[PDB]
Design a protein around this nucleic acid. Sequence first.
RNA 1: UUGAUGUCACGGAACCUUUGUUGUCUUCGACAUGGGUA
Length: 1331
Amino acid sequence: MTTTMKISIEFLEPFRMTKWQESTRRNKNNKEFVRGQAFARWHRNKKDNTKGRPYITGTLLRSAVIRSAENLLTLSDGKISEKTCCPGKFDTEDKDRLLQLRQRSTLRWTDKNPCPDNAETYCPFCELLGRSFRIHFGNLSLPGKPDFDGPKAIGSQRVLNRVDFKSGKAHDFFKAYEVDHTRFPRFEGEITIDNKVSAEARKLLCDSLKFTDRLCGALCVIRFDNLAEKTAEQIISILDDNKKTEYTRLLADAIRSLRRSSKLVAGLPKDHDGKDDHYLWDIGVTIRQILTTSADTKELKNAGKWREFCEKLGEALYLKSKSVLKETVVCGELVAKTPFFFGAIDEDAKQTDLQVLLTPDNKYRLPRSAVRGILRRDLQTYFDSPCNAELGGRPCMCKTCRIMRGITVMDARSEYNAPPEIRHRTRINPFTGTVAEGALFNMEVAPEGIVFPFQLRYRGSEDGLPDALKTVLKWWAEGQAFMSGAASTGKGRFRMENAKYETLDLSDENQRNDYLKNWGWRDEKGLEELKKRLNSGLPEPGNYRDPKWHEINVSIEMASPFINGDPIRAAVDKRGTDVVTFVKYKAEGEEAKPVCAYKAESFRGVIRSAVARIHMEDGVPLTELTHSDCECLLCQIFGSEYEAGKIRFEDLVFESDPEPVTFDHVAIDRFTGGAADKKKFDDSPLPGSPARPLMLKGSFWIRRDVLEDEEYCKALGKALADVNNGLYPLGGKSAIGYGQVKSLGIKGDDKRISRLMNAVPEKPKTDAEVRIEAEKVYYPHYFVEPHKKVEREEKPCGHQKFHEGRLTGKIRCKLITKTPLIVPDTSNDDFFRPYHKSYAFFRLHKQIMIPGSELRGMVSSVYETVTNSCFRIFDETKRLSWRMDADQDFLPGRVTADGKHIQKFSETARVPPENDPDGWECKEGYLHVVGPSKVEFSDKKDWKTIRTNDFKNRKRKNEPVFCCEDDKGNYYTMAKYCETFFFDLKENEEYEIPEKARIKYKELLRVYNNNPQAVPNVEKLKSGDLVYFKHNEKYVEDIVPVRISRTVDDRMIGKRMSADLRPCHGDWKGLCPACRLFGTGSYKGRVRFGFASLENDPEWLIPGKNPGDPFHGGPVMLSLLERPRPTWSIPGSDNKFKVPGRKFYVHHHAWKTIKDGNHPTTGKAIEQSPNNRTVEALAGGNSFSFEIAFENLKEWELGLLIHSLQLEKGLAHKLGMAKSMGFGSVEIDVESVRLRKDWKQWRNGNSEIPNWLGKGFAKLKEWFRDELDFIENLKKLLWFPEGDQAPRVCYPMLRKKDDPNGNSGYEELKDGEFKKEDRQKKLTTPWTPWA
RNA sequence: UUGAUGUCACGGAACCUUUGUUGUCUUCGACAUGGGUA
Ligand SMILES: [Zn+2]
Ligand SMILES: [Zn+2]
Ligand SMILES: [Zn+2]
Ligand SMILES: [Zn+2]
């Protein structure tokens, strides 16, 4: 009587439940509840908080039971047992309580007489239906009833959308909660079956329960049985108290990238100087110390919790920065061939805009909804029949919907659990060539090689398997399965492997019984013993159809270095470099292997920009167009915001195993001629040379509609031909000569796109002459004094198109060396020495060659001198300071800065009472703490009268200061002898506090502390005879600790310029021609210099130790190379002393004396020192060749560029090291000039060089009427000495007392011809002697 | 913590849109310090 037996439900897939509702909101018309009727429900224990439990209703289990009962009733020949059944009751009285209505067609098994509601006996269908409260279905709450904090703690929200077949754009979306099946695997319940309706009813209920395949949205088997907040606050407080408050976003991104492993925290790089003073990590305790104490924590010894801690701290830092049925089964494995991206938005992570989909077990998940949608899309593609199936109403009667009704799949998850890698994407402005502001967004992807299981089942009134499904599976097995997102970026191309299939008839009694007992072979052991008997074959479709996407193979050759930027890998690196190469990881099992690649987004951007440049729509460029709601060619090919593109670009990977190389660069000041402070920057590009070219191979997928379109193929061929002919560079820093395209070859187009990819004058004679005398000595540099008028009235043109009336092409050049040339390779400073720095000549891939940055600097300097323009590099962060001589104004004082209205108190006078009865009055005075800076530095080998006690007074009773031995770092700390201390009331007057004398005093202590000359303390203003002040009106001027010492200026160096000679500010004032040609920080340059290669055997100054190899020279020892001293160029504090101009060196042959170990000035000897160089040089008469690529250059601009390269017959250039010793005199010869009339033809241009020179000279005389004296000054400075003419050029010596020649030294030149009031006129005249 | 004559929700791809790019010759000459007379 009412015997009850327990039941269990085990879920094999992640099931879903709907959002919880209150009893007032438990209605019929609510859309979310009527949608979630198919899923489980949630229950709240108490309404104050979210504590509750889930449960499943009994009506859903009832519906599954009658569905299975109908299936076995229509499968067992319509009849059951030995008595006639019924079709079933179908009647509803009240329409105001219908929660759900049956909109599905009832399966018809017979047209016999239905049994009535009241008869002698009841059929099994009647008692299962309920026509006989007899059968009760219980609830499925939980096994043992564990309590839970909330719904969010047991599952996760997810959003699913609906797409359109024609456009590919989603138009609607909904969301649902999903929980993991491994967290809640098991649900118990009770059921009351029958009392007196015999055994066939319970048997029918038994195989109806056994036939129940799915429930609650998933396939199931029914059986009858810390410190993150504290660390973030500490880091925030330390960054706030210390300086460098910026770069917090980069630090947070670096910390997020650090979550991969715990061992990288001990491998952070240091500063460029080698000390542990990194700008991003050694700021302070240090940030590195904080992360080190966080690393060696017993709590954070594991991996997943360390990852979660790093994610929380990174999020905190980002928030701070703000015969009938025939069941057919198919199984296989989906393998990734590209990195994929399944979208899943989480509100808890606001740092990355797009987030990949993961399980709470940190494993990658492939949902079944995407598989079902892609199957529907491929079916609609094969049949070419869009369907208008609405969400509700009558079921749709299309062929695709009938094929889909019967398709079941199985969710998959992998074993790879490493965190994803972040990818950044940036826009580029077309009118400028730089990245536009506010275009930063990151997004991560799963790596390639992740393998998923795959299962599929079919149930339909058909003998075998549909031909459309067979064709779709053949397409997937070919390797054209595109299911995940970002397809235009080239993401998510899977290939199905190990296809197995078998059909099972569902009308034979034995096979049906095998189905019921074996439970459909849907469990794990069921799959395990089904796979062995599963057939390994695969059928072939009859009406086969070709796929809609075609693969095109691309090969690119690069005879140049290449780099793709990555700031995050630069921040978390092993070495100190500003820029590194982009590197991506691929997964195989659990390990991830890194490879250098070229980003598909970069290639897509380059190709899109090329097509937009070469195609014009009614005069308006495609770059300038908004590309919104327009039918242009670029939107039709590459897609837009409202449609998907018909072309997909894949990632490109390099061949062989290249290794990165290190190149170092520095900026050169225009005036001083030395390297500007804090301007040394490094670079780590991939190596490339014409001898060993780089092979960039890859592919891209194109649609058949574009392939059959003749005009689209023609435009693509035009763009690919323009890319092939060296016009569009790939990568970054192309101005140095990086990433030039030599050759480009495509395959797989059937010769339909690739078929479109198929006398010099002489230099003018010079006219400037220089008189050279055979007994005079000249200064080894001069200034040109450029003109005070510059042009900024020209508006630059953009890079968005090729403007008419301008020239684009290449220039081949030559270079011959007249003096020895030194181009150093600074990677290794210990070549010759087995410490003294050594250096070596530059060599890329074991080939002697010259980088393009040095040549760019030479041509930029000469072009900047010829065309009047700003100083492109100037150290405006320096203040001058000169020493005054003995000569009345600086009155002594002893006062702080508190207030006003003071008197003439305190005592100060010279002392070394017993001499006079009234004198040496000592009442006020305490222990003195003073700055020890009152002894000379005569050298020529403790403070409080211990180490020194001698005087000079011996015979003449005068001058008692004795010449002491200052060579042990002594007698500066030991000071204050004959102190001007006290004993006369004649000092200490008024003082007020300015904002100018104070910073001048701290800069005076900066000069005193950082003195690199007298080293063989205090940074505050204190008393102790340190208030020697002069005053004007009420305020005061600068103060000094010693009555005769160094004084500092108050005018900065940048105010020594002209009104318009200051560097260009931009941010629109206008641009100078040099900034207009070579570019600024917010403007791309229009020239591209290339690397210069050698032709023949290099001749060296000294042969090497091994005569077999002619590629190695011999060492030569250079002399002392010390810093420039602007204090001689600008003599004093006067307003009339300004800057002379830009510095140029002179041509001479002093290296002949330097070869045989002689100084240029003394001629005695050269000794080993820790402060010189021992390099090797290329001899005179060496040929180099290079190429300059230009775009949209004007005629006069090209003429002046040609003039700046060629010069005249008698001039030369300066290159390399030791320009003061006459090293590196080169001349540039123009060999060939090519132009670009059209994309298909490239013409001559060896002619029209005199025409361009004439237009350039016309522009020069347009700018300046007759004041072209700097041109003759340039020609005089660049004039090369002729034969039988060897002038002597050397720097003056420190003193005359050691000169065999007897020439005047610096101290004699100070009073004489190089007087203070005429030094700026005697230095601004080329070849002016001083001897 | 479902209520007994009617549940195709395995009826719905988080899909499409965006070059980490621009600018810089691994270069080179004049000093450092305070007294000492009337
Ligand atoms: Zn019946
Ligand atoms: Zn349809
Ligand atoms: Zn458009
Ligand atoms: Zn400028």
